[PDB]
Amino acid sequence: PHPAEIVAHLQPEIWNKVNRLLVRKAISEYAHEWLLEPQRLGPGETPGFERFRLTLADGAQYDFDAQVMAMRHWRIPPESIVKTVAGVPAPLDALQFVIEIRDKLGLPVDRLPIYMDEITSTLHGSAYKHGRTTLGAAALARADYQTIETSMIEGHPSFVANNGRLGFDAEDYHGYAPEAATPVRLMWLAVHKDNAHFSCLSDMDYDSLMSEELGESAVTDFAARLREQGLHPADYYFMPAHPWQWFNKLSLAFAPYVAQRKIVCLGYGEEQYLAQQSIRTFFNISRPGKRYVKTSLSILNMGGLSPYYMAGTPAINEYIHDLISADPWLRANGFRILREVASMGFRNYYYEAAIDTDTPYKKMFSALWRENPLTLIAPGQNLMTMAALLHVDPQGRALLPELIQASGLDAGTWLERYVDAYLTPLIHCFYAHDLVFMPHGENVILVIQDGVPVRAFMKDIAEESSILNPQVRLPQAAQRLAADVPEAYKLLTIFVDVFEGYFRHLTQILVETELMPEHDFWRLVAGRIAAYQQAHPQRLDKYRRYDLFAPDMIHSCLNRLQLANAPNLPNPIACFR
Amino acid sequence: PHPAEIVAHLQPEIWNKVNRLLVRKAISEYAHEWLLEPQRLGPGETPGFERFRLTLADGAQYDFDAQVMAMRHWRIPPESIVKTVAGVPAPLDALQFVIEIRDKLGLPVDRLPIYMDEITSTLHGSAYKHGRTTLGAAALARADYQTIETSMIEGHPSFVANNGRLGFDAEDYHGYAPEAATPVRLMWLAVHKDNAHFSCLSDMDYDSLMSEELGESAVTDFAARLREQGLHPADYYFMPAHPWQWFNKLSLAFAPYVAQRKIVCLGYGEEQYLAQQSIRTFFNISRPGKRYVKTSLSILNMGGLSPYYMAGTPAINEYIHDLISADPWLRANGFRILREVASMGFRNYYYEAAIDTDTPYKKMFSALWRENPLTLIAPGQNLMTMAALLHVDPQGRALLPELIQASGLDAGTWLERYVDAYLTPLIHCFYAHDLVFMPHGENVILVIQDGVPVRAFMKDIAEESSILNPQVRLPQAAQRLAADVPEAYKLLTIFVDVFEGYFRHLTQILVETELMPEHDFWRLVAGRIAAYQQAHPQRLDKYRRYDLFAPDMIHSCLNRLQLANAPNLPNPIACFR
Ligand SMILES: Nc1ncnc2c1ncn2[C@H]1O[C@H](CO)[C@@H](O)[C@H]1O
Ligand SMILES: Nc1ncnc2c1ncn2[C@H]1O[C@H](CO)[C@@H](O)[C@H]1O
C-alpha cells in the first residue's frame, strides 16, 4: 500500500470547500454563544439578509450575510463569507480563523494546540466525507438504516470541533472511522474474574447471552483455547474489545494484566460489524437481529466506558423499560428505549488505587450489548438516525425535503407526526415520570413508514438518563438514576437538548429548503405541547411549576463548555402560551 | 498475524524478573535523590551489606540489603528485596511500588497515570529485551558496532521511567523500537520552500548532499514524480521522515499542508536503516559510509526536533569541529565530534502563530544528517556506545569484565586508557575552550582496538553544546552556542553528567564484578585529572577558580526533575587534592 494513499482525500479544492463550511459553522456557533459579536454593516449580498463584520486578530476581517433567527441563531450562507487581511482577499481557512480568535476563545496556551488539532481532524474527516462516493439527498432519504448511518456528514450540529477522532492514526482512520464504512471484527479477550464483572437483565444470564452472541462452537473453542494454554476457563469471562483499544491501550497500559494472564487475547471474532456514528458502538452486519456491541475506546472526541456504571447498567435499563411498558400513554404512542441488556467491566486496580476520583483511566476496558431495533419494527418500516433530518449532501441538497416528498404529506402534517413521535413522549416522560434522556440526533432513531415518522427509539440510556425525583423507589442496583436538581434545571432537556440543541438547526434547514417558515414551526410545536397538556389535564400543577411557555430559558453554551474542558435566551414558544 | 503475538513477550516469569529489577532501580535512585529515606535495620542477608527498611503506603514494607557508596549511591542486590503487605509476602511489582509512593513522588493526580504508563511501558520493553534471543556478555563484548547498539537493555541508568516510547502502539513497537532491530526505510516527502529550509556545512550544498544520500536516479525519480502530478520540483526540497511520524502526525495534524500540497508524500526510500538507541536516529545498513539520519518523532520518552535550531545546526557544528581540529592537544588525543553536517526544517506557521513560546508543536517536522564514524576509524578498530560499559545481559553477566579480559590489560590500565579517551578531553574542552557537551553513555562512542579504548567520538552537538563564555567570537549563524552561566554551574558537565550521571553507575559494576574497588577508581580518576593539570600548568588560574577537587558538588536530581516535568554531594575525588 503506497503511504500517500491514506491522505489521497486531502486535495486543494475539496479542502477549500470544507474549510469554508467550517468557518461558517464556527462564525455561527461562536456568535450564538456570545464569543463573537458581529457588527452590522448594512444590507446583505443576498436580499433579505443583512451584512455583518468581524474585526479580528489585528488585520483579519470577515464580512458575511446573516439572518438572526430565534434563540440568537445566526443563519449564514457559506458563499457569502468574505475574508480580507488588511484589505487583501484571503482564502477561508478554519484552523487560521480559530487562531485569529484565540484570545476570544480563552484557551490556556497548551490546550490551544490540542483544540487546533481537533479542528484539523474535523476538517480532515470532512474532506474525506465530501470526497467519498456517496448517495445524494434523494437516494439517501430512501436508503436502508445502515447506509444512512454511515453516510452522515455533519456530526454534532452545535460543536465546531465535533469530529476529532484524535488517537486514530491515518491507517486507523480508514479502518475504524464510521464514515469509511469498513467492516470491523471485534477482538475477543478472556478476562479474569479477579478483575472482570458481568451484569445483565434479570431474565437472562451470561451463558444465554454468549450462546446467542457467539454460539456454542465459538464459546467451546474459546474455553478450549484457554485450557490448551494451561489456563482455567472457570476463572474467565469472554469480553469483546475494539481492535484499536487492544493494540493501543490494553496490550500496553494493561501490560501487567496481560503478563499475569488476567487478560488473554483470543483473537478476532468471525462476525463483521460496522461502526455507528458513536464510533465505539458496532452493528452486526453478518447476522440478523444480533445486539449492538458498545466497547471502550480511548480517543479524544469532544470529551471511554466505565465498569462502575457497567455494574448497574442493565438494572437501570430494566427499570426504565418496565416503567415505559406499564404506562398506557407511552404504550399507545410507541416510544421505546433500546435496552442495554448486559454489560461487562474489567477493573484496573492500579489506576483505581492511584486515583480516588472520576477519571478516563478507570474507563478503558468495558463492553455492553444493546437491543437491535430492526427486530422491533414491521415489514414496510425502516429506521433512520434522527441526525438524518439535518443532513445535507456534498452537492448542498438537504435530505429532509426529499423525505417529506416521499411521504406524500405536506410539511405541516409530516412535522406534526415527527413532533408527536419525538418531542411529545419526552415531555410526557418528564411530566409523568420526571424521566429525562439525552435526546439528540445521534441518540434518537426514528421508525419510518413509507417516508412518515411513526415513532422513536431512544438509545444511550444508563449513562444519560435521570429520574428528577429523589423520592422515586428504585431497585438497589439502579439507585444512581435518581437526581436532585435545581428548579431552573428540570426542563433543560427540552430547552437545552431539544430546542437549542437540535430544533435550532432543524428550522435553519426548514427555512433554507422553504419547507416551512420558522414561526410556523414554533407554532406547530407549541400546539403539540398544548394538545398534550389538554389531554392530560390533571398535571396542571406541574405544567405551571415547570412552564414550557416561560418567556425565556437557560442557555447552555456547548462550545464554551468544550473550550473550558450566558444570559437567558427568549423561548421560541412563549408567544403561544 | 494473530493479534496476541504482539505481546507474546509478556509472560508471568519474565514479568516478575523485570519488575524485581525495576523495583531495585526505583528504590536505589529515589533514595539517592532523597525521595526515599531507608531506615537501617541491622546486618544484611549478604555479608558486607546492611539491611534497610522502607515503610510505605500504610501497610507496604520493603526490606533490602544496601551498601551506600560515594555520591549517596545505594547499591542494592535485586534478590535481597523483600516486600510484605501487613506481614504478608507479596511479589515485587514496580507499578505498584510507584503507587505506594505516590504521595512522596509529588505528582498532580493527572500527571500520575501518565508516569504510571511510562513505568509500564518501561517494563513492557524490559520484558521484551530480556526475553529476546540475544548475545551474552562475552559474545557482545566482541560484537560489531550495530549488534552492540541494538542489544543494549538498560537505557538511561538514572531515570527510572527511562523507556516509555508512549505513542508507539503494540505493532509500532515491533517495527520501530531500537531493541526489535527491525530494518526501517525512511519516508520521503517533498516539502515546499514556502515552509521548508535547509542548512549545511560551508563546503557542501543541498544538491551534493542528495547526490550522496539518494543518488541521481532516486532524486531524478522524485522530481519526475512531482512534475508528473502537476507540481514544480523547483518549489520543493526532499525531506526524510520517520514513517511513524508521517502516519501519526504529519498526514493528520499537518493536513492543511498536505491538502495544499505544501507536503507531498513520495513514499519509502530504497535503503534500509536501523533505529539507534535514540529511537529517532537511523544508521544505514544497506550501504557503506552513509550518514545517519535523525528525524523528528513525537513520542513521549522522558521529555521531537526543532527547525529553529535546524537553521544554525551545521554552523554550530562547523565551528566546534574547526576548533577541535586546530587544537594540538585535542589533535594528539584523537577526541572528535561527529558533525551534524546538514539539517532541514518544515515550519508550521499555524502553531507558530498560535504559540509565541517554546513548544514541542514547533518541532514536529525536521531532519538532520550526521557523520558516520565507521568512515573515521581504521581496520582492526571497532566502535561501541559508551552505554555498553554498563551493560548487564539477561543472565546477569556484565559486559565490562569481558571487554577488559579481551584487551589483555589489567583493569587499572584499561580504565586509565578509558578515562584519558573520555574524561580528559572533556576537561580540556572545558579549561581551554569553556566548551561543554552532554557526555552520557548514549552520546559517546568509543573507538576500541582489540578490547582497548583508544579514543572517543561525541555526538548530539548543536542541541547539547555550549561555550561558557559570552565573549567568544562566533560566526553569525552559531551565536546561540555562547552561554552566560553562574559560577557554581560551570563544572556541572563533569560533576553532574560524568561523575553522578555515569561514573556512579560504572563503579557499581566495577564493584559487583570485583574488577576494582571504588576508592581505587576515584584515585585513578583524580590522578588522570591531576596529570592533565600538570601537563597544562598555565591554566592554574582556572583550575583554582573551577576546582574539580572541591569538597562537595551540586547534585541534580534527574528523577525529581522528570517528576516535576538537594544538598550538595561530597566530591569523590576531594580527598585526592
Ligand atoms: N448527530 C449527532 N448528534 C449528537 N452527537 C453526535 C452526532 N454525531 C456524532 N455524535 C457524537 O457521538 C458521540 C457522543 O457520545 C461522539 O462520537 C460525537 O461525535
Ligand atoms: N544509555 C543511555 N544514556 C543516556 N540516554 C539514553 C541511553 N539510552 C537511551 N537514552 C535516551 O536517548 C534519548 C535521549 O535523547 C531518549 O530516547 C532516551 O531513552
CSV table of N, CA and C in Angstrom, one decimal, chain A residues 1-4 6-8 10-12 15-16 93 95-96 99 102 109-110 112-114 116-117 120-121 124 167-173 187 225 246-248 251-256 258-261 265-268 349-351 353-357 359 361, chain B residues 1-4 6-8 10-12 15-16 93 95-96 99 102 109-110 112-114 116-117 120-121 124 168-173 187 225 246-248 251-256 258-261 265-268 349-351 353-357 359 361:
chain,number,residue,atom,x,y,z
A,1,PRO,N,0.8,-1.2,0.0
A,1,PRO,CA,0.0,0.0,0.0
A,1,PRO,C,0.9,1.3,0.0
A,2,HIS,N,0.7,2.1,-1.0
A,2,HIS,CA,1.5,3.3,-1.1
A,2,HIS,C,1.2,4.3,0.1
A,3,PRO,N,2.2,4.7,0.8
A,3,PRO,CA,2.0,5.5,2.1
A,3,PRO,C,1.2,6.9,1.8
A,4,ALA,N,1.2,7.3,0.6
A,4,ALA,CA,0.4,8.5,0.2
A,4,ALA,C,-1.1,8.4,0.2
A,6,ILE,N,-3.3,7.0,2.1
A,6,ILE,CA,-4.1,7.4,3.3
A,6,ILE,C,-4.6,8.8,3.4
A,7,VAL,N,-3.9,9.7,2.7
A,7,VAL,CA,-4.4,11.1,2.6
A,7,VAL,C,-4.7,11.6,1.2
A,8,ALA,N,-5.0,10.7,0.3
A,8,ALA,CA,-5.5,11.0,-1.1
A,8,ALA,C,-6.7,11.9,-1.1
A,10,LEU,N,-7.1,14.4,0.7
A,10,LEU,CA,-6.7,15.8,1.0
A,10,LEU,C,-6.2,16.5,-0.3
A,11,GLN,N,-7.0,17.2,-0.9
A,11,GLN,CA,-6.7,17.9,-2.2
A,11,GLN,C,-7.1,19.3,-2.0
A,12,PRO,N,-6.5,20.3,-2.8
A,12,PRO,CA,-6.8,21.7,-2.6
A,12,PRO,C,-8.3,22.1,-2.7
A,15,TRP,N,-10.4,20.7,0.1
A,15,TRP,CA,-10.0,21.3,1.4
A,15,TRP,C,-10.6,22.7,1.6
A,16,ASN,N,-10.6,23.5,0.5
A,16,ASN,CA,-11.1,24.8,0.5
A,16,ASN,C,-12.6,24.8,0.7
A,93,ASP,N,-10.0,29.7,5.9
A,93,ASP,CA,-9.2,28.7,6.5
A,93,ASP,C,-9.6,28.6,7.9
A,95,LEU,N,-8.8,26.5,10.5
A,95,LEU,CA,-7.7,26.5,11.5
A,95,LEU,C,-7.2,27.9,11.8
A,96,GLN,N,-7.0,28.7,10.7
A,96,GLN,CA,-6.5,30.0,10.8
A,96,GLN,C,-7.5,31.0,11.5
A,99,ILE,N,-7.2,30.4,15.2
A,99,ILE,CA,-6.0,31.1,15.7
A,99,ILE,C,-6.3,32.6,15.8
A,102,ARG,N,-8.1,33.3,19.1
A,102,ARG,CA,-7.5,32.6,20.2
A,102,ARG,C,-7.7,33.3,21.6
A,109,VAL,N,-2.6,28.4,26.8
A,109,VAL,CA,-1.8,28.2,25.6
A,109,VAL,C,-1.0,26.9,25.7
A,110,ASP,N,-1.7,25.8,25.8
A,110,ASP,CA,-1.2,24.4,25.9
A,110,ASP,C,-2.3,23.4,25.7
A,112,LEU,N,-4.5,25.0,23.7
A,112,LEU,CA,-4.8,25.6,22.4
A,112,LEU,C,-4.5,24.7,21.2
A,113,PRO,N,-3.2,24.2,21.1
A,113,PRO,CA,-2.8,23.3,20.0
A,113,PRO,C,-3.6,22.0,20.0
A,114,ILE,N,-4.1,21.6,21.1
A,114,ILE,CA,-5.0,20.4,21.2
A,114,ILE,C,-6.3,20.7,20.4
A,116,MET,N,-6.8,23.2,18.2
A,116,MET,CA,-6.4,23.3,16.8
A,116,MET,C,-6.3,21.9,16.2
A,117,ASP,N,-5.8,20.9,16.8
A,117,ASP,CA,-5.6,19.5,16.3
A,117,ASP,C,-7.0,18.9,16.1
A,120,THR,N,-8.5,20.6,13.0
A,120,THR,CA,-7.8,20.0,11.8
A,120,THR,C,-8.3,18.6,11.5
A,121,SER,N,-8.5,17.7,12.5
A,121,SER,CA,-9.0,16.4,12.4
A,121,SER,C,-10.5,16.4,11.9
A,124,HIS,N,-10.2,17.2,8.2
A,124,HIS,CA,-9.6,16.0,7.5
A,124,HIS,C,-10.7,15.0,7.3
A,167,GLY,N,-6.1,10.1,18.2
A,167,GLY,CA,-5.7,8.8,18.6
A,167,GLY,C,-5.7,7.8,17.5
A,168,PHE,N,-6.6,8.0,16.5
A,168,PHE,CA,-6.6,7.2,15.3
A,168,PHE,C,-5.4,7.8,14.5
A,169,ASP,N,-4.5,7.0,14.1
A,169,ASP,CA,-3.5,7.5,13.1
A,169,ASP,C,-4.2,7.3,11.7
A,170,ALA,N,-3.5,7.7,10.6
A,170,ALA,CA,-4.0,7.7,9.3
A,170,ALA,C,-4.6,6.4,8.8
A,171,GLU,N,-4.0,5.3,9.1
A,171,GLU,CA,-4.5,4.0,8.8
A,171,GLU,C,-5.7,3.5,9.7
A,172,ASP,N,-5.6,3.7,11.0
A,172,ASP,CA,-6.7,3.5,11.9
A,172,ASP,C,-8.0,4.2,11.4
A,173,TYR,N,-7.8,5.4,10.9
A,173,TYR,CA,-8.9,6.3,10.3
A,173,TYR,C,-9.7,5.5,9.3
A,187,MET,N,-12.3,-7.7,18.7
A,187,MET,CA,-11.3,-8.5,19.3
A,187,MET,C,-11.9,-9.2,20.6
A,225,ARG,N,-9.2,-23.1,23.9
A,225,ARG,CA,-8.0,-22.3,23.6
A,225,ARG,C,-7.3,-22.0,24.9
A,246,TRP,N,-7.3,-2.6,21.9
A,246,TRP,CA,-6.4,-3.7,22.2
A,246,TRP,C,-4.9,-3.3,21.8
A,247,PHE,N,-4.7,-2.8,20.6
A,247,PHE,CA,-3.4,-2.5,20.1
A,247,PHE,C,-2.8,-1.3,20.7
A,248,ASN,N,-3.6,-0.3,21.1
A,248,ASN,CA,-3.2,1.0,21.5
A,248,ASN,C,-3.2,1.1,23.0
A,251,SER,N,-3.1,-3.9,25.3
A,251,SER,CA,-1.8,-4.6,25.2
A,251,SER,C,-0.6,-3.9,25.9
A,252,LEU,N,-0.8,-2.6,26.1
A,252,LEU,CA,0.3,-1.8,26.5
A,252,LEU,C,0.2,-1.3,28.0
A,253,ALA,N,-0.8,-0.3,28.2
A,253,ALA,CA,-1.0,0.2,29.5
A,253,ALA,C,-1.5,-0.8,30.5
A,254,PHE,N,-2.1,-1.9,30.0
A,254,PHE,CA,-2.6,-3.0,30.8
A,254,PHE,C,-1.6,-4.2,30.8
A,255,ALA,N,-0.4,-3.9,30.4
A,255,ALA,CA,0.7,-5.0,30.3
A,255,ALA,C,0.8,-5.9,31.5
A,256,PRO,N,0.7,-5.3,32.7
A,256,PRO,CA,0.8,-6.2,33.9
A,256,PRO,C,-0.2,-7.3,33.9
A,258,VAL,N,-2.0,-8.5,31.2
A,258,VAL,CA,-1.6,-9.4,30.1
A,258,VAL,C,-0.5,-10.4,30.5
A,259,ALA,N,0.6,-9.8,31.0
A,259,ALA,CA,1.7,-10.6,31.5
A,259,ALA,C,1.3,-11.6,32.6
A,260,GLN,N,0.3,-11.2,33.5
A,260,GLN,CA,-0.1,-12.1,34.6
A,260,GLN,C,-1.3,-13.0,34.1
A,261,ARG,N,-1.6,-12.9,32.8
A,261,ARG,CA,-2.7,-13.7,32.2
A,261,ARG,C,-4.1,-13.4,32.8
A,265,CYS,N,-5.5,-12.5,25.0
A,265,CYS,CA,-6.1,-12.2,23.7
A,265,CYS,C,-6.4,-13.5,23.0
A,266,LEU,N,-7.7,-13.6,22.6
A,266,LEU,CA,-8.2,-14.8,21.9
A,266,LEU,C,-8.3,-14.6,20.4
A,267,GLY,N,-8.2,-13.4,20.0
A,267,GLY,CA,-8.2,-13.1,18.6
A,267,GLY,C,-9.5,-12.5,18.1
A,268,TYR,N,-9.6,-12.3,16.8
A,268,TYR,CA,-10.8,-11.7,16.1
A,268,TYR,C,-12.0,-12.7,16.1
A,349,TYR,N,-7.1,-2.2,38.9
A,349,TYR,CA,-6.8,-1.8,40.3
A,349,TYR,C,-5.6,-0.9,40.5
A,350,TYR,N,-4.7,-0.9,39.5
A,350,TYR,CA,-3.6,0.1,39.6
A,350,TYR,C,-4.1,1.5,39.5
A,351,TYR,N,-4.9,1.8,38.5
A,351,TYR,CA,-5.5,3.2,38.3
A,351,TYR,C,-6.4,3.5,39.5
A,353,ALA,N,-6.3,2.4,42.6
A,353,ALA,CA,-5.6,2.7,43.8
A,353,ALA,C,-4.8,4.0,43.8
A,354,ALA,N,-4.4,4.4,42.6
A,354,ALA,CA,-3.7,5.6,42.4
A,354,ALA,C,-4.6,6.9,42.4
A,355,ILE,N,-5.8,6.7,41.9
A,355,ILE,CA,-6.7,7.9,41.7
A,355,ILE,C,-8.1,7.6,42.3
A,356,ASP,N,-8.4,8.3,43.4
A,356,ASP,CA,-9.7,8.1,44.0
A,356,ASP,C,-10.9,8.7,43.3
A,357,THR,N,-10.7,9.7,42.4
A,357,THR,CA,-11.8,10.4,41.7
A,357,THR,C,-12.1,9.9,40.4
A,359,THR,N,-12.1,9.4,36.6
A,359,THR,CA,-11.1,9.6,35.6
A,359,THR,C,-11.3,8.7,34.4
A,361,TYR,N,-9.2,7.0,33.1
A,361,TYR,CA,-8.3,5.9,33.3
A,361,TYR,C,-9.0,4.7,33.9
B,1,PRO,N,-1.6,-12.2,10.7
B,1,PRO,CA,-0.8,-12.1,12.0
B,1,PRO,C,-1.8,-12.2,13.2
B,2,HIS,N,-1.6,-13.2,14.1
B,2,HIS,CA,-2.5,-13.3,15.2
B,2,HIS,C,-2.3,-12.1,16.2
B,3,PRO,N,-3.4,-11.5,16.6
B,3,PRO,CA,-3.4,-10.2,17.4
B,3,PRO,C,-2.7,-10.4,18.8
B,4,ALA,N,-2.6,-11.7,19.2
B,4,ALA,CA,-1.9,-12.0,20.5
B,4,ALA,C,-0.4,-11.9,20.5
B,6,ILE,N,1.8,-9.8,19.3
B,6,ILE,CA,2.5,-8.5,19.7
B,6,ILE,C,2.8,-8.4,21.2
B,7,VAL,N,2.1,-9.2,22.0
B,7,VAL,CA,2.5,-9.2,23.4
B,7,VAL,C,2.9,-10.6,24.0
B,8,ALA,N,3.4,-11.5,23.1
B,8,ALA,CA,3.9,-12.8,23.4
B,8,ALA,C,5.0,-12.7,24.4
B,10,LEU,N,5.1,-10.9,27.0
B,10,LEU,CA,4.6,-10.7,28.3
B,10,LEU,C,4.1,-12.0,28.9
B,11,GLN,N,4.9,-12.6,29.7
B,11,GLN,CA,4.7,-13.8,30.4
B,11,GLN,C,4.9,-13.6,31.9
B,12,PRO,N,4.4,-14.5,32.7
B,12,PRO,CA,4.5,-14.3,34.2
B,12,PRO,C,5.9,-14.2,34.7
B,15,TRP,N,8.0,-11.3,33.4
B,15,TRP,CA,7.4,-10.1,34.0
B,15,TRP,C,7.9,-9.8,35.4
B,16,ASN,N,7.9,-10.9,36.2
B,16,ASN,CA,8.3,-10.9,37.6
B,16,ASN,C,9.8,-10.5,37.7
B,93,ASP,N,6.4,-5.6,42.4
B,93,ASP,CA,5.6,-5.1,41.3
B,93,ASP,C,6.0,-3.6,41.2
B,95,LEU,N,5.1,-1.1,39.1
B,95,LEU,CA,3.9,-0.1,39.0
B,95,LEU,C,3.3,0.1,40.4
B,96,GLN,N,3.1,-1.0,41.1
B,96,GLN,CA,2.5,-1.0,42.5
B,96,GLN,C,3.4,-0.2,43.5
B,99,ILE,N,2.9,3.5,42.9
B,99,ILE,CA,1.6,3.8,43.5
B,99,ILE,C,1.8,4.0,45.0
B,102,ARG,N,3.2,7.4,45.8
B,102,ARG,CA,2.6,8.5,45.0
B,102,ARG,C,2.7,9.8,45.8
B,109,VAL,N,-2.4,14.7,40.5
B,109,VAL,CA,-3.1,13.4,40.2
B,109,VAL,C,-3.9,13.4,38.9
B,110,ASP,N,-3.0,13.6,37.8
B,110,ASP,CA,-3.5,13.7,36.4
B,110,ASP,C,-2.2,13.6,35.5
B,112,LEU,N,0.0,11.8,37.2
B,112,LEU,CA,0.3,10.5,37.9
B,112,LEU,C,0.1,9.2,37.0
B,113,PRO,N,-1.1,9.1,36.4
B,113,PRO,CA,-1.3,8.0,35.5
B,113,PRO,C,-0.5,8.0,34.2
B,114,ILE,N,0.0,9.2,33.8
B,114,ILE,CA,1.0,9.3,32.7
B,114,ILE,C,2.3,8.6,33.1
B,116,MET,N,2.8,6.5,35.6
B,116,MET,CA,2.5,5.1,35.7
B,116,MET,C,2.6,4.4,34.3
B,117,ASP,N,2.0,5.0,33.3
B,117,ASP,CA,2.1,4.5,31.9
B,117,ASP,C,3.5,4.4,31.4
B,120,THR,N,5.1,1.4,33.2
B,120,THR,CA,4.5,0.2,32.5
B,120,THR,C,5.2,-0.1,31.1
B,121,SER,N,5.3,1.0,30.3
B,121,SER,CA,5.9,0.8,29.0
B,121,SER,C,7.4,0.4,29.2
B,124,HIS,N,7.4,-3.2,29.9
B,124,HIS,CA,7.0,-3.9,28.7
B,124,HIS,C,8.2,-4.1,27.8
B,168,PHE,N,3.9,4.8,20.4
B,168,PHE,CA,4.0,3.6,19.7
B,168,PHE,C,2.9,2.7,20.2
B,169,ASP,N,2.0,2.3,19.3
B,169,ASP,CA,1.1,1.2,19.7
B,169,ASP,C,1.9,-0.1,19.6
B,170,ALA,N,1.2,-1.3,19.9
B,170,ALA,CA,1.9,-2.6,20.0
B,170,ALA,C,2.6,-3.1,18.7
B,171,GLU,N,2.0,-2.7,17.6
B,171,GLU,CA,2.7,-3.0,16.3
B,171,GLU,C,3.8,-2.1,16.0
B,172,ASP,N,3.6,-0.8,16.2
B,172,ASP,CA,4.7,0.3,16.1
B,172,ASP,C,5.9,-0.2,16.8
B,173,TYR,N,5.7,-0.7,18.0
B,173,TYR,CA,6.7,-1.2,18.9
B,173,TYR,C,7.7,-2.2,18.2
B,187,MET,N,10.6,7.5,5.2
B,187,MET,CA,9.6,8.1,4.4
B,187,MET,C,10.1,9.3,3.7
B,225,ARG,N,8.3,12.5,-10.4
B,225,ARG,CA,7.0,12.2,-9.6
B,225,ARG,C,6.2,13.4,-9.4
B,246,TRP,N,5.0,10.3,9.9
B,246,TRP,CA,4.1,10.5,8.8
B,246,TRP,C,2.7,10.0,9.1
B,247,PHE,N,2.5,8.8,9.5
B,247,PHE,CA,1.2,8.2,9.7
B,247,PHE,C,0.5,8.7,11.0
B,248,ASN,N,1.2,9.2,11.9
B,248,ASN,CA,0.6,9.6,13.2
B,248,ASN,C,0.5,11.1,13.4
B,251,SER,N,0.6,13.4,8.4
B,251,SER,CA,-0.6,13.2,7.5
B,251,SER,C,-1.9,13.8,8.2
B,252,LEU,N,-1.8,14.0,9.5
B,252,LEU,CA,-3.0,14.3,10.2
B,252,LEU,C,-3.0,15.8,10.7
B,253,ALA,N,-2.2,16.0,11.7
B,253,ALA,CA,-2.1,17.4,12.3
B,253,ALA,C,-1.6,18.4,11.3
B,254,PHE,N,-0.9,18.0,10.3
B,254,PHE,CA,-0.4,18.8,9.2
B,254,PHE,C,-1.2,18.7,7.9
B,255,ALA,N,-2.5,18.2,8.1
B,255,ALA,CA,-3.4,18.0,7.0
B,255,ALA,C,-3.5,19.3,6.1
B,256,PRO,N,-3.6,20.5,6.6
B,256,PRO,CA,-3.8,21.6,5.7
B,256,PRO,C,-2.6,21.8,4.7
B,258,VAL,N,-0.6,19.2,3.7
B,258,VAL,CA,-0.8,18.0,2.7
B,258,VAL,C,-1.8,18.4,1.7
B,259,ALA,N,-3.0,18.8,2.2
B,259,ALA,CA,-4.1,19.3,1.3
B,259,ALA,C,-3.7,20.3,0.3
B,260,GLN,N,-2.8,21.3,0.7
B,260,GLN,CA,-2.4,22.4,-0.1
B,260,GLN,C,-1.1,22.1,-0.9
B,261,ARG,N,-0.7,20.8,-0.8
B,261,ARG,CA,0.5,20.3,-1.5
B,261,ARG,C,1.8,21.0,-1.0
B,265,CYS,N,3.7,13.3,0.0
B,265,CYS,CA,4.3,12.0,0.3
B,265,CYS,C,4.9,11.3,-1.0
B,266,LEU,N,6.2,11.1,-1.0
B,266,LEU,CA,6.8,10.5,-2.2
B,266,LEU,C,7.0,9.0,-2.0
B,267,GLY,N,6.8,8.5,-0.7
B,267,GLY,CA,6.9,7.1,-0.5
B,267,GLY,C,8.2,6.7,0.2
B,268,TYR,N,8.4,5.4,0.4
B,268,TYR,CA,9.6,4.8,1.1
B,268,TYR,C,10.8,4.9,0.3
B,349,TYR,N,3.4,27.2,10.3
B,349,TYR,CA,3.1,28.6,10.6
B,349,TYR,C,1.8,28.7,11.4
B,350,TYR,N,0.9,27.7,11.4
B,350,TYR,CA,-0.2,27.6,12.3
B,350,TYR,C,0.2,27.6,13.8
B,351,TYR,N,1.0,26.6,14.1
B,351,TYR,CA,1.5,26.5,15.5
B,351,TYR,C,2.3,27.7,15.9
B,353,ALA,N,2.1,30.8,14.8
B,353,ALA,CA,1.2,32.0,15.0
B,353,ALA,C,0.4,31.9,16.3
B,354,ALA,N,-0.1,30.7,16.7
B,354,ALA,CA,-0.8,30.4,17.9
B,354,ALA,C,0.0,30.4,19.2
B,355,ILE,N,1.2,30.1,19.1
B,355,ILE,CA,2.1,30.0,20.3
B,355,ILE,C,3.4,30.7,20.1
B,356,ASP,N,3.6,31.7,20.9
B,356,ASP,CA,4.9,32.5,20.8
B,356,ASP,C,6.1,31.9,21.5
B,357,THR,N,5.8,31.0,22.4
B,357,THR,CA,6.9,30.4,23.2
B,357,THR,C,7.4,29.0,22.7
B,359,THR,N,7.7,25.3,22.3
B,359,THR,CA,6.8,24.2,22.4
B,359,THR,C,7.2,23.0,21.5
B,361,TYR,N,5.3,21.5,19.7
B,361,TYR,CA,4.4,21.7,18.5
B,361,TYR,C,5.1,22.3,17.3
